[PDB]
Amino acid sequence: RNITKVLIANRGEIACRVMRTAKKLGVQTVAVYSEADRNSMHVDMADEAYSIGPAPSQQSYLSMEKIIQVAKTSAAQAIHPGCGFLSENMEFAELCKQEGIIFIGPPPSAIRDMGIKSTSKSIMAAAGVPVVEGYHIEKFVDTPRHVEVQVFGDHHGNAVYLFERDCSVQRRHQKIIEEAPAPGIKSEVRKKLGEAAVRAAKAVNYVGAGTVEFIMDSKHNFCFMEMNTRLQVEHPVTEMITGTDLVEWQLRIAAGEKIPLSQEEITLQGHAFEARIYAEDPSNNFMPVAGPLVHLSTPRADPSTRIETGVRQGDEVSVHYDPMIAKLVVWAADRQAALTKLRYSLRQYNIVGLHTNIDFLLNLSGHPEFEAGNVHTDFIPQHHKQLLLSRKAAAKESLCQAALGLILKEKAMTDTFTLQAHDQFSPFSSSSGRRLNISYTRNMTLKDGKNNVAIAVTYNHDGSYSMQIEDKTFQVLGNLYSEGDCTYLKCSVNGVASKAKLIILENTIYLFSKEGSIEIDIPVPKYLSSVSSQETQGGPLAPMTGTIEKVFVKAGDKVKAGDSLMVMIAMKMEHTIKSPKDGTVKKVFYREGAQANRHTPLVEFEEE
Amino acid sequence: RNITKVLIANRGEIACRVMRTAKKLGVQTVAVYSEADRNSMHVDMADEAYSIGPAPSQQSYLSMEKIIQVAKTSAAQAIHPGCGFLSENMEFAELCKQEGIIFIGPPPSAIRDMGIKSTSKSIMAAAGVPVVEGYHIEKFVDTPRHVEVQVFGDHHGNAVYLFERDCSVQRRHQKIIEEAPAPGIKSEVRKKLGEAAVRAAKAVNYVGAGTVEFIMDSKHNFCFMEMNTRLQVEHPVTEMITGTDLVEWQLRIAAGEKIPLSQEEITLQGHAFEARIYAEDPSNNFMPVAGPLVHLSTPRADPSTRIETGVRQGDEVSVHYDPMIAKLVVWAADRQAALTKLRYSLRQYNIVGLHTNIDFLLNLSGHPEFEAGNVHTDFIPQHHKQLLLSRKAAAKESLCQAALGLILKEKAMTDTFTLQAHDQFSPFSSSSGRRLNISYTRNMTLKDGKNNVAIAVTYNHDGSYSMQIEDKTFQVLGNLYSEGDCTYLKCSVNGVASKAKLIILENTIYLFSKEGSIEIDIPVPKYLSSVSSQETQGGPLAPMTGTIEKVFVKAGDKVKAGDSLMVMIAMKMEHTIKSPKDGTVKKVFYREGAQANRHTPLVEFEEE
Amino acid sequence: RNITKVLIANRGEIACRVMRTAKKLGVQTVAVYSEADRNSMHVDMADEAYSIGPAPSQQSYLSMEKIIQVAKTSAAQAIHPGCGFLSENMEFAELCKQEGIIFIGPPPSAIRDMGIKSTSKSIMAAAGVPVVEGYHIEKFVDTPRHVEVQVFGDHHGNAVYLFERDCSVQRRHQKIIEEAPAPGIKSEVRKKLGEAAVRAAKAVNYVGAGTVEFIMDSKHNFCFMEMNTRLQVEHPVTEMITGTDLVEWQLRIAAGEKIPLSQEEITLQGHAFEARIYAEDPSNNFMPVAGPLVHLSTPRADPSTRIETGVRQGDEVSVHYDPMIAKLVVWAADRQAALTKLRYSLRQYNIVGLHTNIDFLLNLSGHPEFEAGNVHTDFIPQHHKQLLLSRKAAAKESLCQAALGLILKEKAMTDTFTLQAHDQFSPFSSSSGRRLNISYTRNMTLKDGKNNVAIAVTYNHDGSYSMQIEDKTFQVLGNLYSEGDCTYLKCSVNGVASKAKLIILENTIYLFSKEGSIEIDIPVPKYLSSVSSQETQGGPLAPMTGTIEKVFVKAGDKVKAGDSLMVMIAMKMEHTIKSPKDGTVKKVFYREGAQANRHTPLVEFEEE
Ligand SMILES: O=CCCCC[C@@H]1SC[C@@H]2NC(=O)N[C@@H]21
Ligand SMILES: O=CCCCC[C@@H]1SC[C@@H]2NC(=O)N[C@@H]21
Ligand SMILES: O=CCCCC[C@@H]1SC[C@@H]2NC(=O)N[C@@H]21
C-alpha cells in the first residue's frame, strides 16, 4: 500500500519525531492540533495542519471521530498514533481499519490481548515466557530492577529483537533515566532473553514495534511483566546502539514491506543513555510545574547528542498536556564515556522560567552506585538523601563575576544609547568611570541567598577592576561576547580565566558555567517596591485548576492557622487548603463539586 | 602523464560538472567561452577562461583551431570535450594527438568506427553482439524500448560494465526521463547483457567511457542498436547507483592509470531516476522557448538529490545553444520511493520567465503505466492524451490566499516607507485599516483564468481578515517570512494552515505549494493601460531568427486571413507565416534567402 | 583511572590539538600560560586557564613546580605534556607520579633509558634492533635516508607499530617535509622493520606513543638511530594514513585501557604529506624571524586538508618560543595526487608581516628528485642551487591588474564616503572619470622591483579601462567582491579572465593568484616622506635580544667600514656587529656580559 501522506494523531516531540522521518522518506505530513497547540512546533513543521477543538485532550487528541474526519478530509492514507493518547486504543485501531485508513501500529487484536494483565500473562505463559509475580496479600517475589526488550514484528509474522534497555531508575514508576544495553547482562543472556520474547511475538503474530517488559533479579533470572503494544518513549537509546530508525520501520511495515535487516545483519556498537527532562520540582516532592520557557538554551547537537525537543524558547508548558520538556540521549564507545558526555551536556542545557529535574539528573548520573551500574527500581527511594541536596554559599570569585557582568551590562546599555546620538565619539560616552587626580570606587551590594554581600569596585585606568569583598582583594577584567543568541562573559579573576553564559532577568543574575550555575539577586530599592502593597490575602489560592472535593468551613467559622478549609483534586493529585490566619471566615467563594481555576480566591476572611 | 591542468572544450552544466571533479582532484581548470557566455557560471568557476569568438557555435565551440590555440596558450596538458560539440569529432581527437595534447576520451579510431552505422553494426556482429534491425521498405522488428549499458575501457584494453539504464521514455527520440537500473531486468540477464557488450569493447580496445545502446523486446531479448563514443548526458543515474564518478575515471584513464575497481568490487545498491528540465512548451507541441530565468528557485540538494544546473537566476536561455535548463537525479532504497522523492522535489523547483516541461514531467512520473515500469519508446505518443491536460478553476481558498498575499505585500511596502521616516512610531504607519465605531470592508477583484472574482475583505480588530466570496465566508490570518531569498506566506483559512512560496511579478500572483502552483491575475486599471495602443500590426513577426525559404506574396497582392505569406526555417524547424487580415499587401520587407531576426516586420499592409 | 579533567602542560598548536581531542571525549581542559601567551588561542580554547609567570620558558613552561601547583589547584587528574618542554623530562614524570597525577606519556624509566645515546643503543642492540653508526675520527658509510616508525605501547606491555614516515628532507637536521608511508619501502620490508622495533618496545615495556628513528641506506638496510620518547611533531601524517587519533590513544592508555585495535584490524589506505610553516627567511640562510601576522589567510580545510594552526591573524611570533606558524598535511589516493593538492593548497596560504619558508616549500615540493621520491638527509644542501631562486620581472598584465586594483580601491573609498552624505545619488559620487567631449587619461606610476613603470589609463564610457604600457595596449575590466574576510579582484585583461586576492597594505599592492603572488610598490611622494630624516645612525642595532660575548672597540678608537665592533649570542646563534662608517668611535653603550635588547644603540660615533 503506497503511503504518500500520513496523519500524525499526536503532539509535541513525538509528532516532530515522526514528521522528521516521514519528510526524510518524501511522505507528506498532516498535523492535528488543539486550540492551545495552534502555534506548536509540530503544527509549523507539518505540510498541512487541522484544528481538532479545545485544549482538553478528551475533546481534542482523544476524539477518535475528529481524528478520522481529518484523515478523510486531508486524504491521509495512514495514521501514526505516536505514543500515549490513541496509540493503545483498540476501538480507534479498528475504526481506522473500518474506514480504510492504515493504522501504523499493531493490529486491534494484539492491543486488546495485551491491554488486560490476566489475558496477557496467560498468553505469555503459553508462549514459554515466564509468568511469575507477587499479587494481592501482595508481596513481590522480585521487586527490584527493570529490563525491557525492543521487539519488531511484521504482517508476515517474522519477528526480531533489538537487545535490551535498563529502565530501573524510576520515581513513582515514572522512568527517569534509561540505558541501552542494560549493564551486566551478557550478550548470550540477552540473546536467550530476546528469543523467549520473540516466540511470544510470533504467537500473537504482532505487527509493528512491541516491548516485552521483564523483571530481572540479582542473579539475572527474568520474568515477563507486561508487553507495551506501542513505540516506547525511550526507543531512542535502542536506535543509538543499533543505528536503526524504528519510526521508519513502523511506516515501511505498515505499508506491507518485509523487515529490512536479518537478525544476522543486526550488530551492536557502543553504549547509550537517555535522561528525560521534566517540568518538575524535585525539592518539592517532584510536583509538576507549569509555566513559560523564558530561557531554553540547549547543548549543540552532534550525531551522539540528540535533543528530542517539542518546545522552543517562549513556549508555555500546559496543565492539560504532559510536563516533559525534552529528552537527551548520547552514544559512546564506552558506557563510562557516555555518562561523562551526558553530564557535560546537561550543564550546557539551561532552563529559566520554571523548575526542572535537570539538577536531580546531574546528581543521579554522578551517584557512585549509578556509575557502578548497581541499579534497581528502589534506587531513587534508597538514595533520596544524596540525590536531593541544599544550596551552598557562593565563592567570592562568583560574586566578582556577577558584579563584572552587571557593570558590562551597564556598559552595553551606554553603547546602545550612544548609537542613536549625534555625538558618537564624545568621551562622556565611555564607561571608564574616570576622575581627575583620584580613582572612582563604587559601593555595590549583591544578595547571595539570604546574605547581603558588599563589594567595593574600583575603576582602574587600564580598564580593569579592583574588587574588595570583606578583607580579600580581587583583580577582575573581562568582556562580553555573543555566540549565537546567548551572551557570554569572558573574565579573569586574580589571573584565573573562565567563560560563562550570562543572563540578567528581572533582579537575578544567572551565570552558567561548566563548573555549575549560580544565581545572584540585585537588591530592589524600597521606593521602586510598591510601598504598602495590599495585605489581607483571601485564603491559599488553588494550587491548580481542579474539582473541589471537600469543604470544611461554614459561612461564619472561627479557624486557626493550619485548619484545613478545602480539599481539591487536580489531574488526580490531592491538595488540602489550610487556614493562613486565625481570623474568622467572612465568606466562601466555592462549594463542593465546583471547578476552581488556578489562583482564584477560595475563602474571604473578616477584616480585623 | 601528469594532468595538472585541463581545458574544458564545452559550456553550461557539463563544463561545471567536469570542473567540479577536476578541482576536487587538485587539477587546474581552463574554460572557453563565446561572447554570449562571457558571464556564464562555468567561466566564473574556472581558474582561467578564454574567449573563442562570437555566439554561433560553428564560429566558437566547434572551432577546433581556436580550442587548440587556447590549450597551447594556457599550457593545458589535456582537453575534456564533455558531451556534444567536438566530443565525437574524430578530426579534433587526432588534432589533439598531433599537438601533444591529451584528448580525455576514446581514440580517433574508435570515434570513426562507431560514427558510421554500417561499420559499427559489422564490428558489433563480429564481436558477438546481435545485429538485427528493420531498415529501408522499413519496418522495425522491435520499435519499443531503449536499454543502454555504461561501459568503461582503458588504454591497457581491460573493459568493465556498470549495469544498465532505461531511456525508453523519449519524445521525438529526445530522452526525457532516464532510470537506473532498468526495471524488470534480472541481475543475471543484465550481467549477460553487459558481457556481450564488454567483448565488443575489448574488440575495439575502447579507451574511456562508452555506451552500448540496445533495443530490448517484451521478452527481454536484446539487440545492439549503436555505441555512443562519449559520456552520456544521463550518466548521473549510473553514478548514483554505483557510487562512482565517471568524469574522475575519464581523467585518471586519460592520464594512463588502470581501472580503479575490479568487476567483483563493483556492487549495486538502490534505484535512481533522472528528469531533464527543458525550456519547452509541452502544450504547444514541445516547441523550444528562449528567454530570461526571472525566477529559478531550486529544491535543496542532499546526497540523493543532485541539481545539475549550468544556469542561475537572471540567466537568459540562448537560441544558439541547447534549451536544457537543468537535470534532476535522485537515489533511493526502492524505485517507488525514488519516484515519490523526485515528484516532491519537482514541486519545489520553480521556473518563471519562460515555459518548461516540469508539469509534463510531473504528469509523466505520476502516470500508472510509468509507476508500474511498463515503459517503451512509444510511451509518450500512446499516453499523450493524459500526460497533457488543461487548466482547472481555482478553489476559493486559493483566492483567499492570493488576496492575503497582496494585502501583506502592501503592508511590507508600508513598513519599507516607514523605515525612512522620522515618525517611526505613528499609528498611521500601521496596516490595521481601522475605523471609528465601524469596520472597514475592502472590495477586491482578482482574475482566475477568464473569470473575475469579487472578494469582500473585512479588516478585523484582532488582525485577522474575514473574506466573502459569493455566498461563502472565510476567516483568514497569516504573515510573511523569508527563507533564504524566497518569501513564504504562512496562512490559515477557516482553521486550515498551510505554507506556500509567494511571488508577485507584474500583475500576476504566483503561489507555490506542495499541493500545486496557482497563478492569479491582478486587473490592470484602464487608465494605466495605454489608451489607443497602436493598431495595424505589420504581419506575424518571425517566430525566431531564421532563413526565409519561401515567399508567396508579390508587392501588391490581395490576401485573406490564413493565406500563407512566407516560410522560415529556424534551427531546422519549419514555420509558415499566415495573413493576419484580409487587407491587400502594401510591401514586403524580406526576399527569399534573407535571414530575418526575431520579431522583425515581414509584410506591410495598406492602411484601410 | 577516570580522566575527567586534563591539564595541558604546553602552548600553541599542540595545546589546541590535545584540547580538541579532550573536548571530543567530554574531558575538561586546563591550559597554562605565560604573560606573553595571555591572549593565545589555547587559553581561549580551554575550559580553565592559569598564569605560570613571565614570558621566558625557563620561568614558565619549564617550571615543574608551577605546573604541578596548577594541576593540584585545578584538580586535574592527568597532565598531557605535548611535545618539547617537559615531555621528555624524567624528573617531571616522576614528580607527577609522586603527586598522584597521571603523566600522559611513557614511564620515567623509559624516558631516562632513551635520553642517553650509549644506554639507548645498548638496550636496542640487546633487543635485536641494529646498533651500527659512525662515531668520533667520525665518518659514515653514505648519506642517510631518514625513516622513522610510529610505535604505540600500553601499561599491559602489548606493543603495535603504525607503518613508517620519511623525514629525510631536513635543513640543519630540522625536519621540513615529512611523508607517510616512506616511498619505495615495500609493505613486507616495513612489516619486518616495525617488528624488530616492536620487540624493543616490549623489552622496555614502553607505555604510550614512541618513535623508533632509523637510518636507511640505498639498499633499504636499516639501523636504529634513536627512540624519541614522546609524540612526534609529524604524527599527523601517520594519523592521515591510518585514520587513528594518537592523542586519543595516549589519553585512553594513560587511563589504563587496552590498545583499541589489533594489528590485524589496522589497514593502510592512500599516501599523506606534511610541510612545516616556519617564520624563517630562506634567502638569508633560514634565519628565524619574529613579528606580527598582519595577514594570515589560510586554505579552506577539508578532511584531507588539515591546518594545524596555533596562531591567528594579528598574533605576534615570539623570540622566546619556537618560530613555527602552522603545519599543513594532506591525504590522497596516490602520492603524486597528494603532492599536487599540497602545492595548490600552499598557494592559497597567505602570510604578510614576516618572512616565511612557504615559497621554499613550493620550490622543494616541485623539485624533480622530490617528485621521484629520491630523498636523503643531504637533499637540501645538494639542491640548494635550485630550491632558492631570485625574483623575476613582472608581466605587463600583472601591472594592469595592480592598477585596476588601485582604481577599484579608490572607487570603494568613494562609495564609503558617499554612504555618509545626505546626497547619496549625485552623479559626482560616481567613479566614471567622465569629461565633456573628451576622454580622461590618467598617468599612473608603479614600481616593480627597482623599475618604475608608467601606465596611461583611459576611463572608457562603458566602464572599462584602456591601459597602455610602453607600446602595448590592454583592455581591462573588473570588479571587487568579498569572500569571507578576503577581498577578491575579478578582472579580464585583453579578454583573459582571472581571479586573485587583493591586499593593499602601506604602499605595496599584494596580488595572490594560483599562478603566483606579485608585489607592486606605489611610489611615495617626496613631500609625504619626511624631508631630511635624521642621519648618523649609531652603529648596527642588535639583531636580537642577546648577551654581549665580545667587545672589540675602546672608548676612542678609529674604525673602518667592516671592522667588527661586538659579538652577540642570541638563542645560541652568533652575530658579529660591523662598523657602518670610517668615523672614530665616540662611546660604547654596552660592555661584555651585558644583555642588549633588540634595536638598542651599541656604539656612538663622533659627529663629522
Ligand atoms: O482513572 C484514571 C486512571 C487511574 C485511576 C483509575 C483507577 S486505579 C483503581 C481502579 N482500578 C482501575 O482499573 N481503575 C481505577
Ligand atoms: O544537417 C544537419 C543534421 C540533420 C540533417 C542532415 C540530413 S538528415 C538526411 C540527410 N542524411 C544525412 O546523413 N544528412 C542529411
Ligand atoms: O645547551 C643547550 C643545548 C645545546 C648546547 C649544549 C652543548 S652541545 C656540546 C655540549 N655537549 C652537551 O651534551 N651539551 C653541550
* Cβ separation C337–B25 shorter than 8 A: yes
User: For B43, phi and psi rounded to 5 degrees?
Assistant: -70, -50
Candidates B271, B273, B370, B496, partner chain A, best to mutate (most A CBs within 10 A)? B496
**Residues paired with C332 in a beta bridge:** C271
Give the Cα-Cα-Cα angle B443, B446, B451 (nearest 5 degrees).
120
Cell numbers placing C544: 636580537
Quote the CA–CA distance of A565 and A422 in Å, as a whole number.
64
What residues contact residue B271 under an 8 Å CB cut-off, 6+ apart? B179, B180, B181, B241, B331, B332, B334, B335, B338
The amino acid at A254: A
CA distance A140 to A133: 6
What single letter denotes the amino acid at residue A48?
A: E
Q: Measured on CA atoms in the order B401, B403, B405, B407, is the torsion positive or negative? A: negative
Classify each residue of A7-20 as buried b or exposed e, where b means 16 or more C-beta atoms within 10 Å of its C-beta: bbbbbbbbbbbbbe
Give me the half-sphere count of Cα atoms (radius 13 Å) on the Cβ side of residue A271: 19
Cβ(B200)–Cβ(B127) under 8 Å? yes
Please indicate whether, in this complex, the C-beta atoms of A26 and B498 are within 8 angstroms of each other.
no
Active site residues of C: 230
| B418 contact partners, CB below 8 Å, separation of at least 6 | B424, B429
DSSP code, position B358? H
Nearest to B557 by CA among B568, B549, B565: B565
Query: To the nearest 10°, the Cα dihedral for C315, C317, C321, C323?
Result: 130
β-strands A486-493, A496-505: how paired? antiparallel
* Short-list B518, B511, B512, B476, CA closest to B496: B476
- DSSP summary character for residue B168: E
CB contact under 8 A, A340 and C27: yes
Residues facing A223 on adjacent strands: A215
Question: Closest to A26 (Cβ–Cβ): which among B340, B490, B498?
Answer: B340
Nearest Cα to Cα of residue B513 among B524, B498, B535, B496: B498
Catalytic residues of A: 230
Q: Which residues in chain A have Cβ-Cβ distances shorter than 8 Å to C49?
A: 496-498
Three-state SS string over B298-349 comes to CCCCCCCCEEEECCCCCCECCCCCCCEEEEEEEEECCHHHHHHHHHHHHHHC
- Our measurement of the distance from residue B105's CA atom to the centroid of its chain's CA atoms, rounded to an integer in Å, reads 26
Centroid of ligand 2 to alpha carbon of C604 (angstroms): 94
Minimal CA separation from B468 to chain A, in Å: 21
Q: Find out whether B173 is annotated in a ligand binding site.
A: yes
Q: Do C26 and A495 touch (CB under 8 A)?
A: no
Quote the CA–CA distance of A180 and C461 in Å, as a whole number. Answer: 73
Residues of C at the B interface, defined by Cβ within 8 angstroms? 336-337, 340-341, 343-344, 490, 495-499, 514
Closest CA to A149 of A249, A207, A88, A223: A223
b/e code A22-44 from CB counts within 10 Å (16+ = b): beebbbbbbbbbbebbeebbbbe
Cα separations (Å) of C284 from B28, B527, C288, C356, C565? 33, 81, 9, 11, 22
| Chosen from B48, B60, B70, B261 to mutate, greatest number of chain C CBs within 10 A | B48
For residues A376-403, one letter each, b for 16 or more C-beta atoms within 10 angstroms of the residue's C-beta and e for the rest, the string is: bbebbeebeeebbeeeeebebbbbbbbb
C-alpha to C-alpha distance for B359 and C46, rounded to whole angstroms: 56
Number of A to C CB contacts under 8 A, please give it. Answer: 27
Q: CA of C340 to nearest chain B CA: how many angstroms apart? A: 6
- Chain C residues in contact with A495 by the CB 8 A cut-off are 50-51
Contacts of B28 in chain C (CB under 8 A): 344, 514
Q: Residues 6 or more apart from A334 whose CB is under 8 A from it?
A: A270, A271
Instruction: Kindly give the distance from the C-alpha atom of residue C573 to the centroid of ligand 3, in angstroms, as a whole number.
Output: 13
Residues of C in contact with B2 (CB under 8 A): 336
CA atoms within 13 A on the CB side of A140: 11
Q: Which residues contact B313 (CB under 8 A, 6 or more apart)?
A: B293, B294, B295, B296, B297
CA distances from C404 to B279, C429, C461 (A): 39, 19, 16
**Interchain CB distance below 8 Å, A514 and C28:** yes
CA proximity to C399, closest of C326, C258, C486, C493: C493
* Nearest C-alpha neighbor of C542 from the set C351, C278, C290, C171: C290
Give contacts of A4 with chain B, Cβ < 8 Å.
Answer: 340
In chain A, the residue whose alpha carbon lies closest to the alpha carbon of B331 is A25
Cell of B262: 575490479
> A256 to each of A105, B430, C34, how far by Cα in Å?
12, 55, 67
Q: Which of C21, C23, C43, C51 to mutate to test the interface with A (most CBs of A within 10 A)?
A: C51
Q: Which chain C positions have a beta carbon within 8 Å of A343's beta carbon?
A: 26
Task: Considering only CA atoms, give the Rg of chain B.
Answer: 29
How far is it, in rounded angstroms, from Cα B580 to Cα B537? 9
Residue keyed to cell 559512546: A332
CA dihedral B489, B493, B496, B497 (to 10 degrees): 10
Say which of B341, B498, B499 has its CB closest to residue A26: B341
**Alpha carbons B350 and B297: distance in angstroms, whole number:** 5
Can you name the residues that pair with B112 across neighbouring β-strands? none
CA angle A286, A292, A295 (to 5 degrees): 100
Resolution in angstroms for this experimental structure?
Answer: 3.0
Element (H, E) at B523: none
Nearest ligand to the CA atom of C116: 3
Last residue before each break in chain B (C–N > 2.5 Å): 136
Contact between chains at B341 and A2 (C-beta distance less than 8 A): no
Residue showing cell 483566492:
B399
B24: cell is 576536487
Which residues fall within 8 angstroms of residue A513, CB to CB, at 6 or more apart?
A347, A498, A499, A500, A501
Going by their DSSP bridges, the two strands B295-297 and B287-288 should be labelled as unpaired
Name the residue among C26, C43, C49 with its Cβ closest to that of A341: C26
Query: Which chain B residues contact residue A48 at CB under 8 A?
Result: 496-498
Nearest ligand to the C-alpha of residue C115? 3
State the distance from the centre of ligand 1 to the C-alpha of C473, rounded, in angstroms.
96
How close, in Å, is residue A177 to chain C by CA atoms? 20
C-alpha cell at A377: 527500581
Three-state SS string over A179-213 comes to EECCCCCCHHHHHHHHHHHHHHHHHCCCCEEEEEE
Burial bucket for residue C548 (CB in 10 Å: 0-12, 13-18, 19+) = buried
List the grid coordinates of B27: 587539477
Backbone angles phi, psi at A8, to 5 degrees: -100, 105
d(CA C219, CA B3): 32
Q: Where are the beta strands (DSSP E) in C514-571?
A: 516-521, 546-551, 564-569
3-state secondary structure at position C507? coil
Torsional sign, CA A359, A362, A368, A369: positive
Give helix C90-98 / helix C108-115 axis angle, nearest 10°: 170
Nearest CA in chain B to A35: B495
What type of residue sits at position A577? I
**Residue B193 to residue A457: CA distance in whole angstroms:** 86
- What DSSP element (H or E) covers A271? strand A271-278
Separation in Å, CA B463 to CA B407, B466, B475: 12, 10, 11
Output the CA B116–ligand 2 centroid distance in Å.
13
Catalytic residue among B165, B230, B276, B335: B230
Q: How far is B337 from B383, CA to CA, in rounded Å?
A: 23
Q: Is the Cβ–Cβ distance between A361 and A367 less than 8 Å?
A: no
* CA C175 to ligand 3 centroid distance, Å: 20
Query: Could you please report the per-residue DSSP string of A366-379?
Result: T-HHHHHT---TTH
CA distance C552 to C564: 7
Beta-bridge partners for A497:
A492, C49
Quote the DSSP letter at residue A584.
Answer: B
> What are the angstrom distances between the C-alpha of B328 and each of B168, B209, B274, B495, C570?
17, 22, 5, 36, 65
Distances (CA, A) of C514 to A348, C278, C344, C348, C500: 43, 21, 7, 7, 8
B337 vs A contacts (CB less than 8 Å) = 25-26
The span from the CA of A532 to the CA of A534, in Å, is 6
Q: Which three cell numbers stand for residue A333?
A: 564507545
Instruction: Name the one residue in this structure whose C-alpha cell is 591550559.
Output: C31
- For residue C159, give the nearest of C106, C221, C108 by alpha carbon: C106
Which of the residues A342, A343, A344 would you substitute to probe the C interface, choosing the one with the greatest number of C C-beta atoms within 10 Å?
A344
Name the DSSP class of B182. P
Cα separation, C7 vs C1, in Å, equals 15
Residues, chain B:
608
Quick check: A497 and C43 CB within 8 A? yes
Strand (E) or helix (H) holding B153: strand B147-153
Contact C36, C42 (CB under 8 A): no
In angstroms, the CA B142 to CA B145 distance is: 8
Residue burial A489-521, b: 16+ Cβ < 10 Å; e: rest: bbbbbeebbbbbbbbbeeeebbbbbeeebbbbb
Nearest CA in chain A to C70: A496
Buried b (16+ CB within 10 A) or exposed e, B336-370: ebbbbbbbbbbbebbbbbbbbbbbbbbbbbebeeb
Helix, strand, coil percentages in chain B from 3-state DSSP, rounded to 5: 25, 30, 45
Do B204 and B151 touch, CB atoms closer than 8 A? Answer: no
Q: Among B53, B50, B45, which Cα is nearest to B20's? A: B45
Among the partner-chain residues A495, A498, A514, the one whose CB lies closest to the CB of C51 is: A495
Distance A242 CA to ligand 1 centre (A): 37
> A289: phi > 0 → left, psi -120 to 50 → alpha, else beta; which?
beta
